[PDB]
Structure 1
């Protein structure tokens, strides 16, 4: 299968600000032979929704086609249907939720007809996770096993529930559609129960679009915004979540925000940390900060400089037969060094350690 001999570490970054928001994002191919993640990040939506913003991560499988079409058109499919448009002037909460549902079903069918029409060869699919942010609400959207969370008052206030085939209601739909869940996979193949695309899994006669083996139906949750307490939102594919839990990553991110306000850098730190914790998948993360996100702290910046210098000295000493980097890391780990970043741990300091190691053993 895939797997490069060495991971592609190149970061693709973007950032932006507006509507009281700031964001950064990072995508990295990592160990995989292809990059099949995509993302959307837009502040200010068309058609009278200038005060709105939209962010999403798409984890494509068996190709990038579906993920790429979604990252460019999911939003307009959501906002440009009668369900979303309700309505008086501003969409009600129901307009928004129904509009998102219709947008997923409609883009799915749209891609299906395009593929049938142009004799598409690909059999790809994609997850989608995102947030539609209005002046007063954050609407979390989830379809698949990517995941998003909201940090409010230093805690995980909300996170999306991953759609896995073994989940009781998912298993039930799958069985009723003539399939089975083998371990964690639909018919022993697909590890997600919900996705756009995967049209081979949506051919069950006598079942509606949301009753197929794989469903395009999103789960939507309206969270009323709190100007005082809302801190940040994280959206990421399973390349991140496979190796860091909700509270770990939330704690980690807060730790990094106390040290820098460069959101691209924070996202890069998350991605590298997850690579160093063993993630061999494509990785994409979007970090969206609200006005009361944690601020850079002079003491936090100092502590980090102290930790980095401490690590540099340890490496100098450990290096003295000249151990390889793997062995230096192993030694460092056995020392149970205090004050490492929460969640990120030693893996989150590997770039610092490797930089020193490289200076001392450049060949």
Structure 2
């Protein structure tokens, strides 16, 4: 897996600020990192994650061999550190998704997420979704919101929001909703890559996600010669469909690219 062929694109769109962050790096000889963070309420929370995630992960790697466990601890560590940082005034309502992929030894893929940023494995030409959206229509998420003293309010567009404010049920930051069910504990997915079958991994933010489903995302990517082109093609398509949000994509090529 060569990081020199990863594609990335981040387009601000019709917003005053780009609140998306993305990154990838080689953390150790065995472990590669890829992440998108889709901010809301100001970029503070996404930028924080973008600034602190590598080190938080690298510190944990000699202590935790289980990548799913590691990523869970890391997300909670990062949220704890962010909350100290905001405390010490819009920062109290700054929040972010976080979708983090670790790839160990070129073959063991672990994805941890809170929120609605997607990670899609293209396996044998078909989308395999490696995240599930943390949104208020989800039965388990609904139930935990009520259990912790939050509630769901539906806006005039028929969209559900936690306490009438937040469209997702897990995030980093959103400190005012951390005691009402909006947790930083991620869900994780583990998959063994198969380099004959597996074509790429694509991470996307809501500027894309609101415009296209995950099959359409794979479609855009597959019509492109390289990941770099693919990553721009995905973001530009979202914009052409009239998206108003920041649009960010990371395309990581695998054996079957």
TM-score by length of 1: 0.66
Q: Residues of 2 paired with 1:144 and 1:22: CA distance?
A: 27
SS in 2 for 1:101: helix
Q: Name whichever structure is richer in strand by fraction.
A: 2
Which digits, 9 at most, give the CA deviation of each residue in 1:18-73, with x for residues without a partner? Answer: 27x7301000100112211111111x21xxx2232111110011010110110121
User: CA contact under 8 A between 1:125 and 1:198: conserved in structure 2?
Assistant: yes
Specify which of 82, 107, 117 is matched with residue 111 of structure 1: 82
Gaps of 5+ in 1: 1-16, 205-211, 294-363
SS in 2 for 1:106: helix
Q: Residues of 2 paired with 1:28 and 1:291: CA distance?
A: 28
Pick 1 or 2: higher relative contact order, CA cutoff 8 A, min separation 6: 2
Q: Residues of 2 paired with 1:290 and 1:50: CA distance?
A: 17
SS in 2 for 1:99: helix
Specify which of 245, 251, 256 is matched with residue 281 of structure 1: 245
User: CA contact under 8 A between 1:38 and 1:71: conserved in structure 2?
Assistant: yes
SS in 2 for 1:80: helix
Specify which of 25, 33, 57 is matched with residue 78 of structure 1: 57
Give the C-alpha shift of residue 147 in structure 1: 0.9
Partner of 2:232: 268
Which digits, 9 at most, give the CA deviation of each residue in 1:303-334, with x for residues without a partner? Answer: xxxxxxxxxxxxxxxxxxxxxxxxxxxxxxxx
2:1 maps to 1:24: no
Matches within 5 A, 1:123-138: 123-135=93-105, 136-138=107-109
Partner of 1:254: 222
User: CA contact under 8 A between 2:220 and 2:230: conserved in structure 1?
Assistant: no
Aligned length: 250
Give the C-alpha shift of residue 134 in structure 1: 1.0
Q: Residues of 2 paired with 1:246 and 1:39: CA distance?
A: 19
Which digits, 9 at most, give the CA deviation of each residue in 1:173-206, with x for residues without a partner? Answer: 110111111121001110011100011112x3xx
User: CA contact under 8 A between 1:79 and 1:103: conserved in structure 2?
Assistant: no
Give the C-alpha shift of residue 86 in structure 1: 4.1
Q: Residues of 2 paired with 1:159 and 1:246: CA distance?
A: 11
Matches within 5 A, 1:50-199: 50-81=29-60, 84-86=61-63, 91=65, 95-116=66-87, 118=88, 121-122=90-91, 123-135=93-105, 136-183=107-154, 184-199=160-175
Q: Residues of 2 paired with 1:158 and 1:176: CA distance?
A: 28
Give the C-alpha shift of residue 276 in structure 1: 0.9
CA RMSD of aligned residues (A): 1.7
Q: Residues of 2 paired with 1:75 and 1:217: CA distance?
A: 18
SS in 2 for 1:27: strand
SS in 1 for 2:29: strand
Gaps of 5+ in 2: 155-159
Please identify the structure whose Cα radius of gyration is greater. Answer: 1
Say if 1:115 and 1:234 are closer, same or farther in 2 by CA, change over 3 A. same
